[model samples]
Target chain A: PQITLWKRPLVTIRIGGQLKEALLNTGADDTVLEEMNLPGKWKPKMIGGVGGFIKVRQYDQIPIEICGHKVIGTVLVGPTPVNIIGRNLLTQIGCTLNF
Target chain B: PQITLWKRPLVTIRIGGQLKEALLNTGADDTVLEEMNLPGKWKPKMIGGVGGFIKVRQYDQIPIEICGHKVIGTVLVGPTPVNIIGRNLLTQIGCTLNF
Candidate 1:
């Protein structure tokens, strides 16, 4: 399926048995979600974003269903204003930019 | 043309006849560039980003050539670490997301 840029490319994703909305952020190098508690070992990490850098909890091999496609990738838990499906997760779903 | 997520999708663009590189930032609401002396009347504005909000100069009807495709849209100039071609300009270039 091809998603046009007429509007914000927000997609429904299921993670940890919960559904949430996330933006398909091509400019972001990593996938970062809002506050969430998952069952796994996470490490503290800092990532630079548009405005500045923020500390986050990095969880590896997290399974997520994005737009009906199942994939597992690294997910970062942080104080982000919105959930973002960045390149790390987007690659697993075979998402590409077409012009 | 399809661009994969194996690497940062940076492309050459011409703004004010100057060639520069930028990222296709789907998460960004508006197109933002590094500090530029664009010729026109610009309004001071603030935009909310991942970490927080930042002040920028909004210039309307700015002409830019992206990957050889010419377009005119509203462009923001500020202290961005990297130039971003957001939805506002991506829509003009007919960039879409596919899986």
Candidate 2:
């Protein structure tokens, strides 16, 4: 499937059977989702940014379905402008940038 | 050309006769670069992020040669962890997401 970048590359995703909207962000190294508590073992950590580090609960081996393709990766639980599906999980689902 | 997500999708860009490395960021709304002095008419603006607004000088209709494709759009001069080539300039070159 090919998605044009005329607008924001937003896609529907399901995490822990919960359907949510997410952006396919190639720029973000880690996927950061808005605070949606999931039952799992998590480690408190930080995600790198310009000004300062953003504190997040790192949940690894978490399963998520993006555009119907289910994959498992690290999902950092935090507050962001939008739910981002970053390179960490994008590579698992074989996402690529093309022209 | 197809770029894999296994590594960061960085490309060489020429802005106002200066060459620089930039990231193809599908997550960012506008293109942001490190503070580089370019002769242009610009306005003091802000770019939104997790913490707060990052101050930037917005220069509109700036010509940038990304790869080999030439594009003119708003380029925000600011401090960032990395130079981000956002949707604003990406769309001009017909970039897309494919899997």
Candidate 3:
């Protein structure tokens, strides 16, 4: 049994106009947002790679809060409802993961 | 107060030759895996879009068993280590999400 402690502050993002908790993966190079419950006005786009071009819909940046951390950016929409806190914002806060 | 019951079967994936317990997000349109623990031979490629092409490194597809189900597919490794089960395969099992 191994216990990995990754205590780099967690960011709680509000999706679909509500607060949905999420852990920011600083190591992640891209910021990903779950497509479910996103509001209109955020444009959608196609993501290429993984055997060719794939669909990565887009969405407007909504207010996100993470332990006194808040910022906004163009979130890459995934087909499912998930929140990925990637390198885009983590670099700004100087975050680190120990896992 | 609401309890969203997502009854979709949970899939356990082994990352970096070790078993990493994870849940299969059926609502997710694409399968995602953390880049930290992926092995070599998967091959890396550039993922374009969202301020120009981004890098979506690749990794070898390992055997994934989810509630007595298994399949093989090319995995797009990310900068960080994260696991995701998207629509490409979810649609194959007629899976459903209750969230």
Of 1 and 2, the candidate ahead on TM-score is 1
Model 1 misses residue A60 by how many Å?
A: 0.4
lDDT of 3 by residue, B1-99 (tens): 111222223356654456655434322344565555554576667643222343666654555544345666556656423356555544444443211
lDDT of 1 at B40: 79
| lDDT at position B54, candidate 3 | 38
TM-score of chain A of 3: 0.58
Which digits, one per residue and each the tens of the lDDT, describe model 1 over residues B2-96?
99998999999999989999999888889999998999799999987778878999999999999889999999999888999999999999999
* Candidate 3 TM-score versus the reference: 0.38
For model 3, residues A1-99, the per-residue Cα lDDT tens digits are 111222222346665567766544422345676556555676656653323344676665655554556666556777423366655555444443211
Which candidate model has the greater TM-score, 1 or 3?
A: 1
Model 2 agreement with the true structure over B1-99: per-residue lDDT tens digits: 889998899999999899999999988889999989877699998787654467889999999999899999999998887889999998899898988
Q: Give the TM-score of candidate 2 (chain A).
A: 0.93
* Residue A30 displacement in candidate 2 (angstroms): 0.9
Stretches of model 3 off by over 4 angstroms after superposition: A1-11, A48-54, A80-82, A97-99, B1-99
lDDT of model 3 at residue A34? Answer: 59
